[PDB]
Scaffold this active site. Structure first.
Site, PDB file in Angstrom:
ATOM      1  N   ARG C  22       0.836  -1.224   0.000  1.00 50.55           N
ATOM      2  CA  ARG C  22       0.000   0.000   0.000  1.00 50.55           C
ATOM      3  C   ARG C  22       0.877   1.282   0.000  1.00 50.55           C
ATOM      4  O   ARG C  22       0.290   2.407   0.114  1.00 50.55           O
ATOM      5  CB  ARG C  22      -0.887   0.034   1.242  1.00 50.55           C
ATOM      6  CG  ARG C  22      -1.861  -1.123   1.438  1.00 50.55           C
ATOM      7  CD  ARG C  22      -2.547  -0.848   2.767  1.00 50.55           C
ATOM      8  NE  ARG C  22      -3.524  -1.784   3.285  1.00 50.55           N
ATOM      9  CZ  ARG C  22      -4.784  -1.922   2.873  1.00 50.55           C
ATOM     10  NH1 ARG C  22      -5.237  -1.227   1.840  1.00 50.55           N
ATOM     11  NH2 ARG C  22      -5.579  -2.788   3.485  1.00 50.55           N
ATOM     12  N   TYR C  55       4.279  -3.825  -7.006  1.00 50.77           N
ATOM     13  CA  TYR C  55       3.537  -2.941  -6.077  1.00 50.77           C
ATOM     14  C   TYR C  55       3.646  -1.475  -6.561  1.00 50.77           C
ATOM     15  O   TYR C  55       4.698  -1.043  -7.126  1.00 50.77           O
ATOM     16  CB  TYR C  55       3.999  -3.096  -4.634  1.00 50.77           C
ATOM     17  CG  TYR C  55       3.699  -4.425  -3.996  1.00 50.77           C
ATOM     18  CD1 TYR C  55       2.722  -5.281  -4.510  1.00 50.77           C
ATOM     19  CD2 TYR C  55       4.394  -4.827  -2.860  1.00 50.77           C
ATOM     20  CE1 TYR C  55       2.451  -6.500  -3.908  1.00 50.77           C
ATOM     21  CE2 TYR C  55       4.125  -6.042  -2.243  1.00 50.77           C
ATOM     22  CZ  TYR C  55       3.178  -6.891  -2.794  1.00 50.77           C
ATOM     23  OH  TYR C  55       2.967  -8.105  -2.221  1.00 50.77           O
ATOM     24  N   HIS C 130       6.085 -14.732  -7.644  1.00 52.15           N
ATOM     25  CA  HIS C 130       4.916 -14.056  -7.043  1.00 52.15           C
ATOM     26  C   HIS C 130       3.658 -14.923  -7.223  1.00 52.15           C
ATOM     27  O   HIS C 130       2.790 -14.901  -6.339  1.00 52.15           O
ATOM     28  CB  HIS C 130       4.751 -12.649  -7.665  1.00 52.15           C
ATOM     29  CG  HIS C 130       3.922 -11.708  -6.870  1.00 52.15           C
ATOM     30  ND1 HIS C 130       3.933 -10.338  -7.143  1.00 52.15           N
ATOM     31  CD2 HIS C 130       3.071 -11.905  -5.840  1.00 52.15           C
ATOM     32  CE1 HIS C 130       3.147  -9.739  -6.277  1.00 52.15           C
ATOM     33  NE2 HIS C 130       2.579 -10.688  -5.486  1.00 52.15           N
ATOM     34  N   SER C 160       5.194 -17.838  -3.862  1.00 53.46           N
ATOM     35  CA  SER C 160       3.972 -17.209  -3.355  1.00 53.46           C
ATOM     36  C   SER C 160       2.758 -17.735  -4.130  1.00 53.46           C
ATOM     37  O   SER C 160       2.868 -17.815  -5.318  1.00 53.46           O
ATOM     38  CB  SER C 160       4.081 -15.720  -3.489  1.00 53.46           C
ATOM     39  OG  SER C 160       2.997 -15.125  -2.804  1.00 53.46           O
ATOM     40  N   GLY C 262      -0.061  -5.167   5.996  1.00 54.10           N
ATOM     41  CA  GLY C 262       0.144  -4.013   5.115  1.00 54.10           C
ATOM     42  C   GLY C 262      -0.739  -2.880   5.603  1.00 54.10           C
ATOM     43  O   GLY C 262      -1.959  -3.059   5.580  1.00 54.10           O
TER      44      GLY C 262
END
Lengths: 298, 298, 298
Positions: C22, C55, C130, C160, C262
């Protein structure tokens, strides 16, 4: 097509396989037309013919045999894949009360004997168990498959529609390596790409064979307009039809999928191998994948 | 019943197991009536009795004990299966606020101590972890199970309702082999036949125990007309009731399923071994399977 | 995360990890504000920072970079986790025709170079693929990840959102051990506790990292009122907020889950370690689990 794939030491297929499941449903099942279908395949380097005991209500192997028995040496130019394990109330099993599976040594042996007799040859290149049998005695089936390899009647053995646990169970009862799993794979049948069925084979370094590699016609019939438009654009870009691009989508996968294209159309046999000319980059593969699934990747 | 099954070197059960989960639902829970049920089983060669700490709100083991304590020598004739790991807010667990699992060393040890006191014996033949615990510490549980076998309080250990990955995880933490997985299997509960739960056990050569082998009553409710027609037909043909055919459907599977039949009915105990009299061929197994899944096999 | 968790001989994380997904959503992305967030983590012993190339539309690592470059030796106080494999059409990949995955050596090497340049460091502590890529060539991806460890640019590699079969395929092609699998786990995403995903890691003794431990905010949305009421009740009993209890629920599991929280809110960052003060007994764990599944355990 021109590309050849070694499933093992003793078995090499054409990367594209000609499916004979509808060979019996053609009006013309003459030995001459069967020879014509096989010759059209061989002209594109497609040498592998996919059969099963059950196809055409247990008559498709006999229609193929009409061809081979008439044309000496045609059989030595092809690989023959057959299958057994489904007992449906049709042809020589019309007395069955219910569709069922039979993976017994006795049934496998009689199915192979009928295959050899119907196709007019003393061996098949590959025998598949046609479906996973919830009543399987893995010890009995595995010994039966090993015995047919040791006899020379079968060059190699594999399975079809097996889940990883079914493949593992039968492999655990066998000395020979199962060399393939023939499973449904296309732009319209993508569950095995994510659900573990394809990863299992990749880890085992086993090539799957893909049946209904076009999604059985559903790609073209009106529910995949977005996917169709992309296939036609790529096809126009590289000088091939949407069909060639859809097959090329399967060929791009690193699991080395062997598509089985089952058609009576001598026009669509003649273009069958165009997929090998397509260049399918990573981004285009995801474009087609996300159009068919109807959602962007996570 | 007649037939016996070695789960290990150390444990042999009757191929049909008497389920005591309803022992506390009988109007009569008197020592005499319990001896009567046991003796009715021993008459058939059904020597294995299936218990759980939780059965009858944590009283069923105490009711069996009434019988065993009143007749010192009955226990030497039977194998006792018990289980732990479920904590319901009932009986000695009234203080629990929420139904939960407890697979801690301390809970297992206190549960076994209570089973041994309630049934009046110094050992049980088989202890199962009753449910897979999403909070299991496999190292702690595995150590506790191994210690119970080494102490002689438990002859062998197994699990119940474990998925293959639950079974794999717990086995990875233990020296002793888990000898069974007691799971729901019946013509009404067929998912394990295809979803990898049974293939896993078959590959590892572990006999499952099948709970609710009749759908725990719902098979005879008249919702499954097509299935009951075939069970009743086959029963009439072989001189047994529908329930003996439904159990025989499980016994026909090559994974050597051990059904657990729970009933207070002395007449149904007297006929519990009739399942072993049924001969069921492959086609008939698939007829019943087909009727139960409500469609043809693929 | 006063508590530390060794993922390998070369990599130790804080038990709670600060997720920076974020960081580009904050109106203020200034170096001083980024330092304030890292400093608030360090005050509580939260040393591990979770990043990804993607991100903030491929800008979040550069935002972190601004903070680290402004404070020499801040980078030596933290572990940096980053990820690659997702190509969205945003920032430096805005040329992409479609969101896709790329696990090629070329893409992995360029993504890691961009991570090291943007964050102003010569190495990252952990690199994760990812997302599981259906076009993964495990041999190529695996050699690329092993080459990065051998170079020193990456101390350790992990994955992930991999299913156990994806984890197994990639691990089969590598010399280095994959040290974690970063998966979604929360009181609103509990499937991995029962579906084999957590059991697989627990058997391999691999600590998962949990992302969205609060559902990315959905837990407080209004669709989980029963879960929230229990979280606030437990939170009030122990002098912490609902967030701390929801994270403590993950920490209680024996598989040694590493939660990734986050948030841009400096007062939530300042209490992020409160989860470690929560006493979460077995019954309370099952109270919250029962609320997650909407019914009693079986």
């Amino acid at each position: 097509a021109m590309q050849r794939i070694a499933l093992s030491d003793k078995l090499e297929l054409s990367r594209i396989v000609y499916g004979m499941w509808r060979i019996g449903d053609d009006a013309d099942t003459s030995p001459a037309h069967v020879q014509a279908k096989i010759e059209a395949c061989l002209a594109q380097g497609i040498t592998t013919m996919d059969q099963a005991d059950i196809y055409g209500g247990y008559t498709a192997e006999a229609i193929l045999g009409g061809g081979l028995k008439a044309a000496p040496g045609l059989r030595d130019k092809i690989e023959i894949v057959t299958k057994c394990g489904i007992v449906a109330p049709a042809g020589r099993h019309s007395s069955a009360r219910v569709k069922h599976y039979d993976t017994t040594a006795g049934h496998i042996n009689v199915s192979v004997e009928a295959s050899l007799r119907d196709m007019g040859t003393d061996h098949v290149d590959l025998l598949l168990i046609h479906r996973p049998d919830p009543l399987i005695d893995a010890e009995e089936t595995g010994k039966a498959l090993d015995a047919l390899v040791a006899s020379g009647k079968v060059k190699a053995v594999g399975v079809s529609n097996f889940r990883p646990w079914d493949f593992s169970l039968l492999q655990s009862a066998m000395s020979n390596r199962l060399v393939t799993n023939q499973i449904e794979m296309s732009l319209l049948a993508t569950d095995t790409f994510t659900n573990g069925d394809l990863a299992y084979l990749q880890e085992k370094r086993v090539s799957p064979m893909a049946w209904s590699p076009l999604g059985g016609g559903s790609l073209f019939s009106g529910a995949y307009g977005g996917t169709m438009a992309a296939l036609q654009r790529i096809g126009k870009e590289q000088g091939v039809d949407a069909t060639a691009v859809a097959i090329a989508w399967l060929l791009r996968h690193p699991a080395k999928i062997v598509p089985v294209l089952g058609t009576n159309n001598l026009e669509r046999i003649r273009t069958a191998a165009d997929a090998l000319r397509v260049t399918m980059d990573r981004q285009t593969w995801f474009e087609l994948y996300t159009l068919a699934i109807g959602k962007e990747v996570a």
